[PDB]
Design a binder for this molecule. Sequence first.
Ligand SMILES: O=C(NCCOP(=O)(O)O)c1ccc(OC(F)(F)F)cc1
Ligand SMILES: O=C(NCCOP(=O)(O)O)c1ccc(OC(F)(F)F)cc1
Ligand SMILES: *Cc1c(COP(=O)(O)O)cnc(C)c1O
Ligand SMILES: [Cl-]
Ligand SMILES: [Cl-]
Ligand code: NA
Ligand code: NA
Lengths: 265, 396
Amino acid sequence: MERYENLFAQLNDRREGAFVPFVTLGDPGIEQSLKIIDTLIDAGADALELGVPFSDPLADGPTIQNANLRAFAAGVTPAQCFEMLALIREKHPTIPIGLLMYANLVFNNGIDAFYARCEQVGVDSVLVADVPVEESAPFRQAALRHNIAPIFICPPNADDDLLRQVASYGRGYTYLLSRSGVTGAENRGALHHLIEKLKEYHAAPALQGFGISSPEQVSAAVRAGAAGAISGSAIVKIIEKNLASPKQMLAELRSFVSAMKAASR
Amino acid sequence: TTLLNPYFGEFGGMYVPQILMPALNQLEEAFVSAQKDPEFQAQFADLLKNYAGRPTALTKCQNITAGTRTTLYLKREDLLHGGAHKTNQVLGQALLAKRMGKSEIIAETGAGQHGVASALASALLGLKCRIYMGAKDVERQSPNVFRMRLMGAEVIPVHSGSATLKDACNEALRDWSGSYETAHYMLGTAAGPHPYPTIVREFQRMIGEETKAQILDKEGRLPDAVIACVGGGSNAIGMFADFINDTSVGLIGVEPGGHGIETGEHGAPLKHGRVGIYFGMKAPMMQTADGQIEESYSISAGLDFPSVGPQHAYLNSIGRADYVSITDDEALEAFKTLCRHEGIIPALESSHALAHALKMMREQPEKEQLLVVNLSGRGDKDIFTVHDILKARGEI
Ligand SMILES: O=C(NCCOP(=O)(O)O)c1ccc(OC(F)(F)F)cc1
Ligand SMILES: O=C(NCCOP(=O)(O)O)c1ccc(OC(F)(F)F)cc1
Ligand SMILES: *Cc1c(COP(=O)(O)O)cnc(C)c1O
Ligand SMILES: [Cl-]
Ligand SMILES: [Cl-]
Ligand code: NA
Ligand code: NA
């Protein structure tokens, strides 16, 4: 399967950028997360980035910290997350699905076994937040052996050696980091040098993330040469604000994704 | 690409988000530079001597061993300024931060001890110190919090996750990932991502260096074994390091057994956890079957950390060091025994090391053995803890 490649070719044929929401699997519960995810797709999400609840999400600001706690309050486990992933893929055969993982959940029962499970449920990519490219060899080898794209962060500081490693080692897409710090829509981020060198080094198409919360940020990212944008905290805040109002949550979620998706043309 | 080996066998590494690798690489380069710089070494040695009080005494404990063939010495890190060994390495890291042009210090703390050590070093060297503490730990360590604030440090309660040490750790790393251009993260033990296990060992290794010199002067030979408690690993690797190549010298690390290993309420990941990747490192840790990071337990808050430094896991794997555990009740008895028979109030952390030495003596009282226990701290801070337990069980 080549879902990212098929998606990017189709988007390029439409002169269109990708819009890719992030949510935490099982936030605020399994059944309502499945509904959340179907609504994001129905509103125009091009791909999905999905987090598996972890006890210590050290790359995440308060918004997604709280999403993990909500998922844990519902008893969500990695095993339940993989059951959800299988159902999501069964409903939606072509949308690329990427996981955002912390290393211990991948390493826990064996690196190879984790990526085999991803392949079996139909996952397309894995970004391990706390595995830098310097430590990535066993992860990206297991990923590729199971037809999973390993995703790597390209930070703002990236020197030429990092650019070459990210270009050579990543597949699916390059996660182009807008700024330093952790996730959060309360801290907005910033390049034409990174996007150009990544293209020069035949890197996977670049998606910009961290702090993408407004539709004009999506258009700016595409205009700068990125293939699209990822938005996390901004989506999860809609979940947070409407916990008591399930149906209102789905409606606000649908409106925001549709607004974001429209901006990628 | 690194200057030094980030691994100890399979253990260690640099498992941090990509955005933090430049800060770790910068720190490694500064450390390697500093280690070659006689002016840095002279400054560090001067602080250790004239501010912290090094060398610390090596005390022979005659009353405790009477009637046995054990000779027991205590290395007196309890006499170090601040009352614990942590002061050694925070002074070195504070000097590194200045070498790098950093004017701010970030530190994490559970029991408060590292927070106080970071605060005093920062006050002396004119650094602006902020300390992350899990909210549960803030509540039960109000004396250490007040010491930190008296020394001008900003103490920031952490309410996320389980509101304890690992959650303070996360928050320190989150802050450093955005602030490392001006702030140094002064990690508090011989664990975390490279280069910290290496830096903290090298900035604690004077414990063993002095111990070797002192025991040779007093006894004319090396110890049969040196024994140290292990929470994260810094006082133990500080005592062990200069003895690693003396293969006749046993290295014994003591993890907290809490209410007993079989209860699951303990702090002994090295011998009773499972290797995981977190805290920036591949190391044994307490974790669920799913891989969620678990909570440890010990009567002694300073040992209450659910992983261990990677060099200890390595030294264990090759058989160079042996690791054991000591329960709350065993540590409490060692605490009482030292007070009554030597007039020294030991930290409840250190009491775990003393308790194992007392076991080594009592189990084989006719075995000739020359032992050194690293007395990593004094136990003034623990007298209320010991008072309340003794009253609850009907001894007081
Ligand atoms: O995609 C992510 N978050 C959602 C989008 O960010 P935001 O909109 O700011 O919440 C995301 C990606 C990577 C990550 O860890 C690290 F950078 F280290 F790999 C953490 C979060
Ligand atoms: O144990 C730690 N600090 C000890 C604090 O000492 P105390 O004040 O006595 O609780 C400790 C702190 C940080 C760490 O790694 C990382 F930064 F990645 F999280 C690992 C262990
Ligand atoms: C913090 C502390 C310890 C445990 O930390 P290590 O890094 O394992 O040495 C032990 N003793 C005292 C007195 C402490 O303050
Ligand atoms: Cl698995
Ligand atoms: Cl290795
Ligand atoms: Na420990
Ligand atoms: Na604990």
